[PDB]
Amino acid sequence: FVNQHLCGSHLVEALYLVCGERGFFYTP
Amino acid sequence: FVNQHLCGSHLVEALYLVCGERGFFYTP
Amino acid sequence: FVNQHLCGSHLVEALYLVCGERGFFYTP
Amino acid sequence: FVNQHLCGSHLVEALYLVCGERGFFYTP
Amino acid sequence: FVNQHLCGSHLVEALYLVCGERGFFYTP
Amino acid sequence: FVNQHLCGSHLVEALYLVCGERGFFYTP
Amino acid sequence: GIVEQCCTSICSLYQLENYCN
Amino acid sequence: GIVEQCCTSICSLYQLENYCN
Amino acid sequence: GIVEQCCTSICSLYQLENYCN
Amino acid sequence: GIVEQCCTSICSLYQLENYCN
Amino acid sequence: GIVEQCCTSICSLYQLENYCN
Amino acid sequence: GIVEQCCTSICSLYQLENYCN
Numbered sequence A, B, C, D, E, F: 001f002v003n004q005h006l007c008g009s010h011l012v013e014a015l016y017l018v019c020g021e022r023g024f025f026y027t028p
Numbered sequence G, H, I, J, K, L: 001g002i003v004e005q006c007c008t009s010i011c012s013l014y015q016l017e018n019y020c021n
Ligand SMILES: Oc1cccc(O)c1
Pocket: A002, A005, B017, C007, C010, C011, C014, G006, G007, G009, G010, G011, G012
């Protein structure tokens, strides 16, 4: 639903910042 | 170093949109 | 309402990415 | 080419905020 | 709650743009 | 001048995430 | 148009592309 | 302050500007 | 996983860090 | 265009308003 | 990697799709 | 300031925390 899709996008930005040069897999 | 860092941020958002339910992997 | 305003902002980023060198008109 | 592309992304968000209900046009 | 956290993040971007070289304090 | 401006935008989002309930100050 | 359509259901990139020029 | 005000109604750029330094 | 966890409560940076590689 | 004007100098909000509909 | 390919040239959506799971 | 320190080198989250209230 739209709210979950929009939250994800914020979630990936937060992961980008936290994970740094480690990276991440994103699976929703 | 700031440019690659800021580029990655954009990259992550684009991968989020293009990958949908598959998710993606981000390796810096 | 706030939720629609916030959704729009995501919507324009998604259009930017999809439309590429074609561009878009955004009308809410 | 990446710099204009990443600039456009910011441009689009700013136009969204400044234009409100009028919307805007984005031509790259 | 998640919705308020997400709204904040949009709020700081809008303040960045409006306030310009003046800056701002953000207190939630 | 555009580069510092676009960097600030990213900076603001990162400060939002790292500071949580404390908030932050942004001085350009 | 776009807001009523894409803020009520997730629009795919194919749906969004209809709004391009 | 800002969250109670601007996450319950759309704040215009003029409303937001009150929070500038 | 991440969406059910972090879209229902605010995940801190410490919670998010669990999803890093 | 907006990219020539506003990716080479910082455009004000007033200047950006020239690209509203 | 994606940073070498896509921070030095503009990657299309098709190209970005190579980094989906 | 933050722009001098953090737009010329990548600031860690620890370093960014120096600009919290
Ligand atoms: O339905 C939507 C709403 C906002 C962004 C997006 O990619 C899709």
